[PDB]
Amino acid sequence: PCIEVVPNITYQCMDQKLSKVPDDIPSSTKNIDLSFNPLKILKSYSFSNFSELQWLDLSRCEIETIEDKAWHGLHHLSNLILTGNPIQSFSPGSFSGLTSLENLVAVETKLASLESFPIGQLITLKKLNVAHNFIHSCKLPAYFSNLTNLVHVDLSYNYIQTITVNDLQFLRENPQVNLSLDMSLNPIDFIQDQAFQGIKLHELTLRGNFNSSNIMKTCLQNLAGLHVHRLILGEFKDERNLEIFEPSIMEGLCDVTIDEFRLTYTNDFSDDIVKFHCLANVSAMSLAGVSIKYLEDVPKHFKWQSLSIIRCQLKQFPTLDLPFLKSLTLTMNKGSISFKKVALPSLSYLDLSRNALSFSGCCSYSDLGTNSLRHLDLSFNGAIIMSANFMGLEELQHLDFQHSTLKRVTEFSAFLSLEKLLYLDISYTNTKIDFDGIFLGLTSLNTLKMAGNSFKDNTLSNVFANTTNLTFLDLSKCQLEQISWGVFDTLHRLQLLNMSHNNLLFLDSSHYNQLYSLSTLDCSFNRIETSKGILQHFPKSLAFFNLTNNSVACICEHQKFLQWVKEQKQFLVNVEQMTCATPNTSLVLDFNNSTC
Amino acid sequence: PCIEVVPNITYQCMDQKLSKVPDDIPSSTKNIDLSFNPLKILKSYSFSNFSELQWLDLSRCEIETIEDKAWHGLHHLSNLILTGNPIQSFSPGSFSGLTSLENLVAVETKLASLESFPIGQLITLKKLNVAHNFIHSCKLPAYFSNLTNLVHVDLSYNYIQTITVNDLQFLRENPQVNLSLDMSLNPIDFIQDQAFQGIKLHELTLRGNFNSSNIMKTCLQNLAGLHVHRLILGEFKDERNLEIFEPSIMEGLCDVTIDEFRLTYTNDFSDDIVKFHCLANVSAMSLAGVSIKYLEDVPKHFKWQSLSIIRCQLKQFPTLDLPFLKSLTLTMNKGSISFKKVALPSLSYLDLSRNALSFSGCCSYSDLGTNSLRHLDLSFNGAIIMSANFMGLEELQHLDFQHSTLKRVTEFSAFLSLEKLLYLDISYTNTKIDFDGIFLGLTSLNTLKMAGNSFKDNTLSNVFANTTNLTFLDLSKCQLEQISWGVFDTLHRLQLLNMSHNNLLFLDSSHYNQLYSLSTLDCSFNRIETSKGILQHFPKSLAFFNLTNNSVACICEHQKFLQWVKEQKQFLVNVEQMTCATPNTSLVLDFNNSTC
Amino acid sequence: QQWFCNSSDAIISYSYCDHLKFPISISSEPCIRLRGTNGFVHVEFIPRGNLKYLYFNLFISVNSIELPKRKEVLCHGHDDDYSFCRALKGETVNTSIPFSFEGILFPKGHYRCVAEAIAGDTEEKLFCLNFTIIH
Amino acid sequence: QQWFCNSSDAIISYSYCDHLKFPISISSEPCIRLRGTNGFVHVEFIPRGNLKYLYFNLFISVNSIELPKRKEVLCHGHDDDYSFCRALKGETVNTSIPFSFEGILFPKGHYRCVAEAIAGDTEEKLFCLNFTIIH
Ligand SMILES: *[C@@H]1O[C@H](CO)[C@@H](O[C@@H]2O[C@H](CO)[C@@H](O)[C@H](O)[C@H]2NC(C)=O)[C@H](O)[C@H]1NC(C)=O
Ligand SMILES: *[C@@H]1O[C@H](CO)[C@@H](O[C@@H]2O[C@H](CO)[C@@H](O)[C@H](O)[C@H]2NC(C)=O)[C@H](O)[C@H]1NC(C)=O
Ligand SMILES: *[C@@H]1O[C@H](CO)[C@@H](O[C@@H]2O[C@H](CO)[C@@H](O)[C@H](O)[C@H]2NC(C)=O)[C@H](O)[C@H]1NC(C)=O
Ligand SMILES: *[C@@H]1O[C@H](CO)[C@@H](O)[C@H](O)[C@H]1NC(C)=O
């Protein structure tokens, strides 16, 4: 028939050439996809048996007519998707029956107007999407006042050319309504004078709207008197773009009040379009996919609380001294910038990942000029040379270096100051652990991710003595061959311990006797022959002991271990699948008779 | 009782409590060190026995007297070291007998004058070292014209305050003499007018000479006339003096002709001293220990043929566009710097090693502006992002990436253009080799060092099919477990294969048949139990086959291998100490008895 | 099968994958030169899933020698550069995407690229193309 | 015990290594504050070999936890910074070496450091100091 993902709950019926609904699917199903089937016409009582549906997908289903009361037993449905159906005209009470509907997706349905759109019935409606249609007007229909729960309306990819005073009349008589408007991909050249006066919006998206700089500047002026929380601006690569892009095209904006401002891709860009005076009173500033090359002479009187730089093109690390900036993201930069010392006395969050960043002299107060930093992400970067053990940054809770090249970290107690750190990731940093005091000072740490590294003489050393609060320890892929006596004796709170993908030839249970909280022990993909020690030293809290893909020696020499496997088969994972590798199938099937 | 470093040839008698030369030293030795002994007096004939002596070291022996004919028997002696003996006066005939002496070291002997030093007989003399004495005079004596083989005189750390025109008369007289003069650590405050007029020197060292910047400016001016091949200028950390060091101090140097110019540590250093017009015609330019922070000024008409920046303090990668610079060395810089475009059309030699250097976009002609690059050293640096496979640099023959973070070198054929490369080091660059065509293009390669990396699934894949001219191959410490089948068959000239320190469970002889030229195979520090598959197949040429520090199985399954170890005794490294590791000493003692 | 072109240094063709045959019309004007090309990729299809998190797996081989899997992301799901990242399942996409590239040295011979398009949210194949490049 | 001082956060002292006793008198002005210090190391001795390729092997221990072998090259053999580099076997050296450091976070305990002075060319040991710091 179809495909069954979750029994009695979720089914996939795509590209199955169905005429109508397969009406033998459980009468208690939650979610169903029927997209890409030539349904053609949607008869009445066709959906009737499924009283507990929530998600219906009828995308590109050749549908031209919705019969009156096509939805009969759907007073529980919340998501309805009708993308790419030549319905065109929606009759009175087309959606009669959906009283619990939250999201209505009417993209590419040949829909001409929101006036004729028979939705003034659906009280519970939150989101409405009418992108890719034949909508000419921008009028917010009067019935929207019955739509008490509506917050997002998508008007992308349409034919709206004017935003007039009359269009936004609904909003003007209703300043209490939290509403967002995606207005992207409309060819707008005229916005009426005083059209945006005394209106409030949550987020306004104006991407790829304007054909020339003159039209853009003119229109933004006539946005006067708008309060928006979030204004998304810019254009697309796969669209014909504004040739000349000066900062003065932004001029209209400082007659509107903006909380957060998001500029996206622009064909032309001037580095000093970000240090523009109309953006001074903004609390969050964002750049994404932007040709910015330098970010430097930003005025000190700017109110920016967060600054986000994603997939831009900086040739240099920015000079910044904004005294009120709490949060900074500079990530996925196109080139390979090196860190330049910065002064941000309010910073508590700093993501500088995925930049191939050089950082020589990491890290201490003088690098940042903050006392408040809790989150430091320097993952997926170049060479980071440790020379200072975070003096001045003891507020840190989250430190992430995964996949960066950490240098000199074994040279000294590089993390000594981080008394309050909860999370440390030094996985795939190529650190050869060489020093027993590497983790000294990490007394609060819960999570220690250090996969991919290695240890002197391939022996796991007493590096954990004082990391008492560890609940999670990943030591996978560290080429481990031997574990030192006492290494875990202090880890009383530890729950998961990953040592998969090493070269251990055996386990010794005594290594784990103090591990009273250990629910997960992953020892798979080693070369484990047996377990020495008193087998009763394995934690009674153990729920998932993974010993798959090892190489067990089914000799009488190890008769007790082999029994113990039968004994504990409830707690070992993929037990029956395990197979011997000595004298070649299987394992739970070892006997007990060759001298033993 | 003297230490014997080379029986019958070299004896070491340092810091015994000796009173004279012991006669029980073979009258056959060529070198002897008698330093740090209370010798006190050099009694006549002391050394008459040892006639074949070439090197005698009597440093710190508390010698106050050299008797007549003290050196009587020493026909062949070329080296005599007298440092630190308070022989205040040297009488005529003090050095009589040394008819072969090439190097006299009379450092800290309390000498007061060259003029009264009885070396005018020693015609073989080449190097005269009189540093650390009580010499007040820079006069080069009349008897120098008999010392026709003298090429270096060290006059350092003496009390010379002046250089006069009659001090240098000998050199003026005999312009055919190759002399180097080390004048360091002399409180020079006055050089007479015209004192260096018409005088030629190979190397002249003036480090730590001048109490003041004016004193230097004013003394350099009277170097006018000098022709020097190598001038070394500067001061010492522990002996500073120069408050300021500006281009104008360098002024007297337009009136001197310099082939090579070297600047050493200075207390102060102005960046624009490198841009000084009187250094335009200099052929080799050099900076070591220098406070220079930016090298960017350089006029494009400068003639420099090489440039050396060693242990300096550059904040940025130099901007260079010098048309005749053949060779550039920037090494051991403070901090990180990232590579920046240079345009050096003549450039053949490039050492940018040991800089924690970060290079994104390695690399092509457009990084360098050169087509004649023969040597590229990028070792001991940071992130090197491979992005271009050396197009434009097809002449390269030596390429060093040792200990740097090489990146993306596996994503394409990064050395494709390098059809002339002879030497490639990618050791410890942390490369997981998952592309068989990584060395495509390297058809002339002889030496490939790639120790301390790794391979997909720890199997040594067929990456050497086209590297046919290989003579040295280092694959040690590569976590290798398995060797693919035809992996070495093409390497007919291969002389040295280092595969020590991997995780090989066995060898298979037929991997190495087809290595017709192999003389050394290192398979130590693996976990080899035996070698399977016909043992004649090991190359006839194989002279040194190391198998020590493995874990060999002395069971009946491997009778062939074990027997074979007995007849291939001569070709196996340290067979004397190889012990068994199964069913615990020794190995070659294994006998066919039960079953086998 | 589906499309062919030849530039001054390459012949380029694609067919659908043996495992998957959902329709896409992809084309490049001009035909890709491996030395360097400025032009557009024209794409016209009806996506079988949402394109908010579109990424490609590129499986490339040169004369049977195979490069490691290559992941390329086009829509990260937040302020994306292209108009089609907002395009939904079963929506008509018609777009021209401009591009340029400087050109590296490539070995002469036969190139196989299998390019899987993934919807990173569902993690399900959107389409699959089997490119041939003879250089 | 050869010498000792105390500063606002350290008692420093040294003796010679058990197995190597060649004499050097070495001190600082002022005493070393681990917080940070600017001053001079005063060195006075007679080298057992040429100082042309002088380097140190420091073996450092913090509360018995030993750091990896640390190598500090003082004379590379070419245009070196210190006037003592040119000193020969048996030559008297009397010099004071300026320095300054800013100070990292240190315990809070007992420090051991064996400084082994090696003549790089011959690989001979010049001297060896058993240092002890209490912070
Ligand atoms: C322990 O570490 C390894 C990875 O280091 C994890 O193994 C992964 O398991 C997934 C399951 O989807 C495999 O398909 C992946 O290939 C593995 N990842 C690898 C090899 O990098 C393992 O999940 C970790 N154990 C636990 C309990 O989280
Ligand atoms: C000047 O005399 C000196 C002899 O010391 C020559 O300098 C040596 O030259 C050779 C090769 O030409 C080098 O290998 C040595 O290391 C050089 N020594 C120094 C200290 O530079 C120099 O070549 C002679 N010049 C002339 C014209 O005879
Ligand atoms: C194969 O590779 C290793 C490099 O790791 C070499 O091992 C060195 O061997 C010498 C023995 O004379 C030792 O003194 C060194 O300690 C070893 N070095 C290291 C880093 O462990 C080995 O020499 C290479 N094979 C050959 C033939 O040179
Ligand atoms: C071992 O089992 C655990 C829990 O069942 C699982 O999460 C983990 O992925 C397994 N380890 C490996 C290497 O597959």
mmCIF file of N, CA, C and O in Angstrom, chain A residues 14-15 33 35-36 57 59-60 83-84 105 107-108 129 132 156 182 184-185 207 232 236-238 262 264-265 288-289 311 332, chain C residues 22 40 46-50 74-86 88-98 124:
data_model
loop_
_atom_site.group_PDB
_atom_site.id
_atom_site.type_symbol
_atom_site.label_atom_id
_atom_site.label_comp_id
_atom_site.label_asym_id
_atom_site.label_seq_id
_atom_site.Cartn_x
_atom_site.Cartn_y
_atom_site.Cartn_z
ATOM 1 N N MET A 14 3.593 8.759 -0.991
ATOM 2 C CA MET A 14 4.070 9.715 -1.980
ATOM 3 C C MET A 14 4.384 9.027 -3.302
ATOM 4 O O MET A 14 4.907 7.912 -3.314
ATOM 5 N N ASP A 15 4.061 9.701 -4.407
ATOM 6 C CA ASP A 15 4.354 9.218 -5.762
ATOM 7 C C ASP A 15 3.785 7.812 -6.018
ATOM 8 O O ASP A 15 4.411 6.987 -6.692
ATOM 9 N N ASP A 33 1.007 11.921 4.690
ATOM 10 C CA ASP A 33 1.445 12.631 3.499
ATOM 11 C C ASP A 33 0.896 11.937 2.255
ATOM 12 O O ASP A 33 1.093 10.734 2.057
ATOM 13 N N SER A 35 1.108 13.796 -0.817
ATOM 14 C CA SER A 35 1.651 14.631 -1.885
ATOM 15 C C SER A 35 2.108 13.824 -3.108
ATOM 16 O O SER A 35 2.403 12.631 -3.009
ATOM 17 N N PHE A 36 2.139 14.498 -4.258
ATOM 18 C CA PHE A 36 2.596 13.923 -5.529
ATOM 19 C C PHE A 36 1.747 12.750 -6.043
ATOM 20 O O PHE A 36 2.228 11.884 -6.778
ATOM 21 N N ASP A 57 -0.635 16.467 4.297
ATOM 22 C CA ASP A 57 0.178 16.999 3.206
ATOM 23 C C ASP A 57 -0.374 16.559 1.848
ATOM 24 O O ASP A 57 -0.352 15.377 1.497
ATOM 25 N N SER A 59 0.516 18.235 -1.175
ATOM 26 C CA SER A 59 1.279 19.091 -2.081
ATOM 27 C C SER A 59 1.334 18.506 -3.490
ATOM 28 O O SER A 59 1.452 17.295 -3.661
ATOM 29 N N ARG A 60 1.249 19.382 -4.487
ATOM 30 C CA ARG A 60 1.197 18.999 -5.908
ATOM 31 C C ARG A 60 0.338 17.739 -6.167
ATOM 32 O O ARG A 60 0.834 16.681 -6.586
ATOM 33 N N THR A 83 0.320 23.087 -1.367
ATOM 34 C CA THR A 83 1.273 23.658 -2.323
ATOM 35 C C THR A 83 1.098 23.146 -3.765
ATOM 36 O O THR A 83 0.973 21.943 -3.989
ATOM 37 N N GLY A 84 1.088 24.071 -4.726
ATOM 38 C CA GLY A 84 1.081 23.732 -6.151
ATOM 39 C C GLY A 84 -0.144 22.991 -6.659
ATOM 40 O O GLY A 84 -0.018 22.055 -7.446
ATOM 41 N N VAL A 105 -1.206 26.311 4.521
ATOM 42 C CA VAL A 105 -0.194 26.527 3.493
ATOM 43 C C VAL A 105 -0.810 26.480 2.085
ATOM 44 O O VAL A 105 -1.097 25.405 1.547
ATOM 45 N N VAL A 107 0.435 27.957 -0.898
ATOM 46 C CA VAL A 107 1.423 28.410 -1.874
ATOM 47 C C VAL A 107 1.100 27.835 -3.249
ATOM 48 O O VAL A 107 0.727 26.659 -3.366
ATOM 49 N N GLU A 108 1.235 28.682 -4.272
ATOM 50 C CA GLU A 108 1.044 28.306 -5.680
ATOM 51 C C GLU A 108 -0.300 27.616 -5.960
ATOM 52 O O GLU A 108 -0.354 26.560 -6.595
ATOM 53 N N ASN A 129 0.214 31.030 4.847
ATOM 54 C CA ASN A 129 1.204 31.160 3.790
ATOM 55 C C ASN A 129 0.552 31.182 2.413
ATOM 56 O O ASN A 129 -0.010 30.180 1.968
ATOM 57 N N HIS A 132 3.836 32.710 -3.787
ATOM 58 C CA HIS A 132 3.769 32.171 -5.152
ATOM 59 C C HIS A 132 2.365 32.113 -5.707
ATOM 60 O O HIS A 132 1.924 31.080 -6.207
ATOM 61 N N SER A 156 5.321 36.315 0.070
ATOM 62 C CA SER A 156 6.455 36.188 -0.846
ATOM 63 C C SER A 156 6.033 35.862 -2.267
ATOM 64 O O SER A 156 4.994 35.235 -2.486
ATOM 65 N N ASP A 182 6.023 38.542 5.811
ATOM 66 C CA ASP A 182 7.041 38.256 4.810
ATOM 67 C C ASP A 182 6.568 38.825 3.477
ATOM 68 O O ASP A 182 5.568 38.372 2.916
ATOM 69 N N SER A 184 8.721 39.448 0.782
ATOM 70 C CA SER A 184 9.859 39.286 -0.123
ATOM 71 C C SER A 184 9.428 38.873 -1.523
ATOM 72 O O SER A 184 8.407 38.214 -1.693
ATOM 73 N N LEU A 185 10.223 39.264 -2.514
ATOM 74 C CA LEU A 185 10.002 38.884 -3.913
ATOM 75 C C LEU A 185 8.752 39.486 -4.567
ATOM 76 O O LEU A 185 8.169 38.893 -5.479
ATOM 77 N N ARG A 207 13.029 41.338 1.301
ATOM 78 C CA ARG A 207 14.147 40.811 0.520
ATOM 79 C C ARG A 207 13.819 40.750 -0.961
ATOM 80 O O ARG A 207 12.721 40.351 -1.338
ATOM 81 N N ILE A 232 14.187 42.530 8.258
ATOM 82 C CA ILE A 232 15.089 41.772 7.389
ATOM 83 C C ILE A 232 15.163 42.431 6.005
ATOM 84 O O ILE A 232 14.139 42.609 5.331
ATOM 85 N N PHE A 236 18.803 38.692 -3.318
ATOM 86 C CA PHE A 236 19.298 37.342 -3.601
ATOM 87 C C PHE A 236 20.302 37.300 -4.760
ATOM 88 O O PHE A 236 20.256 38.145 -5.656
ATOM 89 N N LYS A 237 21.185 36.298 -4.757
ATOM 90 C CA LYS A 237 22.149 36.082 -5.852
ATOM 91 C C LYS A 237 21.482 35.739 -7.187
ATOM 92 O O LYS A 237 21.848 36.284 -8.236
ATOM 93 N N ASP A 238 20.512 34.827 -7.131
ATOM 94 C CA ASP A 238 19.752 34.403 -8.304
ATOM 95 C C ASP A 238 18.631 35.392 -8.682
ATOM 96 O O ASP A 238 17.579 34.995 -9.188
ATOM 97 N N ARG A 262 18.400 43.046 10.316
ATOM 98 C CA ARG A 262 19.098 41.982 9.587
ATOM 99 C C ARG A 262 19.299 42.308 8.115
ATOM 100 O O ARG A 262 18.349 42.315 7.330
ATOM 101 N N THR A 264 20.878 41.025 4.677
ATOM 102 C CA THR A 264 21.336 39.828 4.009
ATOM 103 C C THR A 264 22.112 40.206 2.745
ATOM 104 O O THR A 264 22.549 41.351 2.600
ATOM 105 N N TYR A 265 22.283 39.241 1.846
ATOM 106 C CA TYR A 265 23.098 39.428 0.650
ATOM 107 C C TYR A 265 22.738 40.685 -0.133
ATOM 108 O O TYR A 265 21.564 40.990 -0.336
ATOM 109 N N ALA A 288 24.583 38.797 7.108
ATOM 110 C CA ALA A 288 24.666 37.403 6.643
ATOM 111 C C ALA A 288 24.837 37.310 5.120
ATOM 112 O O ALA A 288 23.953 37.698 4.368
ATOM 113 N N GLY A 289 25.988 36.804 4.685
ATOM 114 C CA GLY A 289 26.292 36.646 3.272
ATOM 115 C C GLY A 289 26.647 37.965 2.625
ATOM 116 O O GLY A 289 26.318 38.199 1.452
ATOM 117 N N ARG A 311 28.883 34.223 7.390
ATOM 118 C CA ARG A 311 29.277 34.031 5.976
ATOM 119 C C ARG A 311 29.584 35.329 5.217
ATOM 120 O O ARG A 311 29.184 35.507 4.073
ATOM 121 N N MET A 332 31.794 31.380 10.018
ATOM 122 C CA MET A 332 31.840 30.948 8.625
ATOM 123 C C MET A 332 32.345 32.032 7.673
ATOM 124 O O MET A 332 31.926 32.107 6.514
ATOM 125 N N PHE C 22 13.969 11.187 -9.663
ATOM 126 C CA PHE C 22 13.119 12.382 -9.582
ATOM 127 C C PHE C 22 13.594 13.478 -10.548
ATOM 128 O O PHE C 22 14.792 13.738 -10.634
ATOM 129 N N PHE C 40 25.782 31.117 -15.700
ATOM 130 C CA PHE C 40 24.652 30.793 -14.850
ATOM 131 C C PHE C 40 24.376 29.305 -14.897
ATOM 132 O O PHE C 40 24.611 28.648 -15.911
ATOM 133 N N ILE C 46 10.435 20.617 -9.704
ATOM 134 C CA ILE C 46 9.489 20.670 -8.601
ATOM 135 C C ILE C 46 10.037 19.828 -7.454
ATOM 136 O O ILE C 46 9.901 18.607 -7.476
ATOM 137 N N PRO C 47 10.679 20.481 -6.460
ATOM 138 C CA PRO C 47 11.292 19.799 -5.316
ATOM 139 C C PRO C 47 10.355 18.863 -4.573
ATOM 140 O O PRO C 47 9.196 19.200 -4.325
ATOM 141 N N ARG C 48 10.879 17.690 -4.231
ATOM 142 C CA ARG C 48 10.118 16.641 -3.559
ATOM 143 C C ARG C 48 10.125 16.813 -2.035
ATOM 144 O O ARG C 48 9.538 16.016 -1.301
ATOM 145 N N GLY C 49 10.799 17.861 -1.574
ATOM 146 C CA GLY C 49 10.839 18.220 -0.160
ATOM 147 C C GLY C 49 11.104 19.706 -0.053
ATOM 148 O O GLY C 49 11.325 20.379 -1.065
ATOM 149 N N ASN C 50 11.081 20.228 1.168
ATOM 150 C CA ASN C 50 11.421 21.631 1.376
ATOM 151 C C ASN C 50 12.922 21.888 1.155
ATOM 152 O O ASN C 50 13.762 21.016 1.409
ATOM 153 N N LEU C 74 24.020 24.831 0.483
ATOM 154 C CA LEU C 74 23.518 25.984 -0.266
ATOM 155 C C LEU C 74 22.531 26.811 0.548
ATOM 156 O O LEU C 74 22.460 28.033 0.400
ATOM 157 N N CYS C 75 21.771 26.130 1.399
ATOM 158 C CA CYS C 75 20.859 26.782 2.316
ATOM 159 C C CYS C 75 21.121 26.259 3.720
ATOM 160 O O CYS C 75 20.923 25.071 3.996
ATOM 161 N N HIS C 76 21.583 27.146 4.599
ATOM 162 C CA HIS C 76 21.824 26.793 5.995
ATOM 163 C C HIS C 76 20.570 26.923 6.806
ATOM 164 O O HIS C 76 20.494 26.391 7.909
ATOM 165 N N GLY C 77 19.582 27.640 6.269
ATOM 166 C CA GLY C 77 18.276 27.776 6.918
ATOM 167 C C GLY C 77 18.015 29.088 7.636
ATOM 168 O O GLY C 77 17.103 29.181 8.454
ATOM 169 N N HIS C 78 18.816 30.102 7.326
ATOM 170 C CA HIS C 78 18.723 31.412 7.960
ATOM 171 C C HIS C 78 19.365 32.406 7.055
ATOM 172 O O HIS C 78 20.561 32.328 6.799
ATOM 173 N N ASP C 79 18.568 33.345 6.559
ATOM 174 C CA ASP C 79 19.046 34.418 5.689
ATOM 175 C C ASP C 79 19.955 33.904 4.573
ATOM 176 O O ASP C 79 21.108 34.320 4.447
ATOM 177 N N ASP C 80 19.415 32.997 3.766
ATOM 178 C CA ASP C 80 20.163 32.376 2.664
ATOM 179 C C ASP C 80 20.270 33.232 1.396
ATOM 180 O O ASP C 80 19.424 34.089 1.130
ATOM 181 N N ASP C 81 21.310 32.974 0.611
ATOM 182 C CA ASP C 81 21.648 33.822 -0.523
ATOM 183 C C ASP C 81 20.721 33.655 -1.722
ATOM 184 O O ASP C 81 20.714 34.496 -2.626
ATOM 185 N N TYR C 82 19.945 32.575 -1.739
ATOM 186 C CA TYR C 82 19.163 32.227 -2.926
ATOM 187 C C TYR C 82 17.668 32.220 -2.665
ATOM 188 O O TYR C 82 17.219 31.887 -1.561
ATOM 189 N N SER C 83 16.907 32.594 -3.693
ATOM 190 C CA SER C 83 15.451 32.674 -3.605
ATOM 191 C C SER C 83 14.795 31.310 -3.440
ATOM 192 O O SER C 83 13.696 31.222 -2.892
ATOM 193 N N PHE C 84 15.469 30.256 -3.902
ATOM 194 C CA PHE C 84 14.894 28.904 -3.875
ATOM 195 C C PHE C 84 14.962 28.191 -2.526
ATOM 196 O O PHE C 84 14.303 27.167 -2.335
ATOM 197 N N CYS C 85 15.745 28.730 -1.596
ATOM 198 C CA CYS C 85 15.819 28.178 -0.243
ATOM 199 C C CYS C 85 14.487 28.311 0.513
ATOM 200 O O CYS C 85 14.222 27.548 1.441
ATOM 201 N N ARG C 86 13.650 29.270 0.115
ATOM 202 C CA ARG C 86 12.322 29.411 0.721
ATOM 203 C C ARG C 86 11.264 28.556 0.028
ATOM 204 O O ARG C 86 10.176 28.347 0.577
ATOM 205 N N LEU C 88 9.015 25.648 -1.217
ATOM 206 C CA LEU C 88 8.489 24.521 -0.451
ATOM 207 C C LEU C 88 8.417 23.235 -1.259
ATOM 208 O O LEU C 88 8.700 23.232 -2.461
ATOM 209 N N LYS C 89 8.046 22.143 -0.586
ATOM 210 C CA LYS C 89 7.789 20.873 -1.254
ATOM 211 C C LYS C 89 6.642 21.027 -2.241
ATOM 212 O O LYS C 89 5.587 21.565 -1.897
ATOM 213 N N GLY C 90 6.861 20.556 -3.465
ATOM 214 C CA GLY C 90 5.827 20.554 -4.490
ATOM 215 C C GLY C 90 5.585 21.918 -5.102
ATOM 216 O O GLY C 90 4.531 22.151 -5.694
ATOM 217 N N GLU C 91 6.561 22.813 -4.952
ATOM 218 C CA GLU C 91 6.494 24.160 -5.509
ATOM 219 C C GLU C 91 7.344 24.212 -6.772
ATOM 220 O O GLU C 91 8.339 23.496 -6.888
ATOM 221 N N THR C 92 6.942 25.046 -7.722
ATOM 222 C CA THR C 92 7.675 25.196 -8.972
ATOM 223 C C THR C 92 8.855 26.155 -8.773
ATOM 224 O O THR C 92 8.672 27.303 -8.351
ATOM 225 N N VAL C 93 10.058 25.662 -9.060
ATOM 226 C CA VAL C 93 11.282 26.458 -8.957
ATOM 227 C C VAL C 93 11.824 26.705 -10.353
ATOM 228 O O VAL C 93 12.069 25.764 -11.109
ATOM 229 N N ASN C 94 11.994 27.975 -10.695
ATOM 230 C CA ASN C 94 12.638 28.354 -11.941
ATOM 231 C C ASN C 94 13.609 29.485 -11.655
ATOM 232 O O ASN C 94 13.204 30.595 -11.315
ATOM 233 N N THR C 95 14.897 29.183 -11.768
ATOM 234 C CA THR C 95 15.927 30.121 -11.357
ATOM 235 C C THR C 95 17.228 29.937 -12.127
ATOM 236 O O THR C 95 17.524 28.846 -12.609
ATOM 237 N N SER C 96 17.980 31.030 -12.239
ATOM 238 C CA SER C 96 19.317 31.031 -12.818
ATOM 239 C C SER C 96 20.290 31.491 -11.737
ATOM 240 O O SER C 96 20.138 32.582 -11.183
ATOM 241 N N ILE C 97 21.281 30.658 -11.433
ATOM 242 C CA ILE C 97 22.236 30.979 -10.379
ATOM 243 C C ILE C 97 23.581 31.320 -10.987
ATOM 244 O O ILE C 97 24.230 30.455 -11.571
ATOM 245 N N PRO C 98 24.003 32.589 -10.849
ATOM 246 C CA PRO C 98 25.304 33.021 -11.357
ATOM 247 C C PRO C 98 26.456 32.400 -10.561
ATOM 248 O O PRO C 98 26.296 32.089 -9.378
ATOM 249 N N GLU C 124 16.456 13.336 3.688
ATOM 250 C CA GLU C 124 15.998 12.488 2.593
ATOM 251 C C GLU C 124 16.422 13.001 1.219
ATOM 252 O O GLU C 124 16.445 14.208 0.980
#
